[PDB]
């Protein structure tokens, strides 16, 4: 097939993924370069939905200049019927990589943790708190993790495994800290902290319950265990901040 974003023509390669009203494609431009085009249908979209979309685009377009750990938005075409976004194409999303891969390299993990802190820190410096961080929000692009979205735009998906206790109780940057710790905990232990609880009502009860001790099995990396223990502190007031995580021995020491 084929498609037009501004003047430029794009040959479709495959469908990289989906959404409700959205479809993502792997494409080639006239210079035979690879990109991702996110198509969004605005046909049955309300004003609040439209505005949530316009807000997330404006933020992504802006924050691109601030960090390379944020996905590139090269161009876009917005009408009253559709949105076309020409973005950088990834190799695989972090969830699909983690699900496929057996064990993760301690260096690979440390490197990915670093990238995650850098992307989230950036959004936070611009007043953005994602609140729905999951491995699916990150993209491997040449051994580099990139943040896919900001959580602003309406609508794995629906998962409560990375949900902070305060979000269940009903939201500060500390909420994203909890969710990041759940991601690192998965990369460390091969499961999210409350993954063994099937029942969603029982799972939500465990997360909020302080008498429910989160287990941190002894790994050779004492620095990595401390990060996990720091991130996964139920009281947001007792939880480590992102600027504090960037100065932690796990990130800084050889
Ligand atoms: C936006 C831009 C690029 C991608 C995306 C969403 N999902 C993906 C999944 N796998 C690879 N690349 C991408």
Swiss-Prot record:
Residue ranges of the TM segments: none
Tissue specificity field: Present in rapidly proliferating cell lines.
Binding site for ATP: 16-24, 38
Domain Protein kinase residues, every copy: 10-251
Active site per the UniProt annotation: 132
Family: Belongs to the protein kinase superfamily. Ser/Thr protein kinase family.
Binding partners and assembly: Interacts with TPR; the interactions occurs in a microtubule-independent manner. Interacts with MAD1L1 and MAD2L1.
Protein name (record): Dual specificity protein kinase TTK
Organism for this UniProt entry: Homo sapiens
Full-protein residues shown: 519 to 794 of 857
